[PDB]
Prior knowledge:
This protein is an alpha/beta fold. The protein contains five helices and six strands; from the N terminus they run βαββααββαβα. Helix 1 packs parallel to helix 5. This is von Willebrand factor.
Amino acid sequence: SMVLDVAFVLEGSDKIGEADFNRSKEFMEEVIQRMDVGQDSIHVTVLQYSYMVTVEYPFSEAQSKGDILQRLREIRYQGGNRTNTGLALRYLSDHSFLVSQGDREQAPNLVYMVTGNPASDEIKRLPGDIQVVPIGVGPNANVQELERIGWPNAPILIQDFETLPREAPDLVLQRCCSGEG
Ligand SMILES: *[C@@H]1O[C@H](CO)[C@@H](O)[C@H](O)[C@H]1NC(C)=O
Ligand SMILES: *[C@@H]1O[C@H](CO)[C@@H](O)[C@H](O)[C@H]1NC(C)=O
Ligand SMILES: [Ca+2]
């Protein structure tokens, strides 16, 4: 009944580290489990980023909850020496959300992006047909950058990675899905 194209983007840099990445992955998996994901409803794509952007699941592969969860359970922390948030945002606009890559023109493009550090590269807000909700986590997230990305809405700010998988899934569901889930 809910027709949305949802991207999750997780920072996996050396500064995040493996344990906090695992907490971000748990956050993502909980949300996916609770969303109405499926062939004719919510579609999911997933990026992990640091220096480079890794497509962990594209819109063009099977949009079935089981297939998505299996793959996401199998993928792992990538590490890396930058937080190239701008590169990741450009990737969403230039590739992830193209109709040629499985985007549906009529389904709103929503992004939930978890970051814990200031960007290493240049940040500009994406063209507005892409709605980005940044989730800043811990004391080194740059609030002004996240406001720029997320305008007109406030970023979701989470105190630390321990708190992320316990508080953030409800917050995302409130935004995407009227709190149903
Ligand atoms: C992260 O999760 C993976 C996959 O379950 C596990 O093998 C690994 O030990 C975890 N790492 C940390 C630091 O918790
Ligand atoms: C940082 O990561 C990049 C991309 O993998 C790599 O080319 C470069 O050597 C790394 N920098 C250092 C100082 O190791
Ligand atoms: Ca779309």
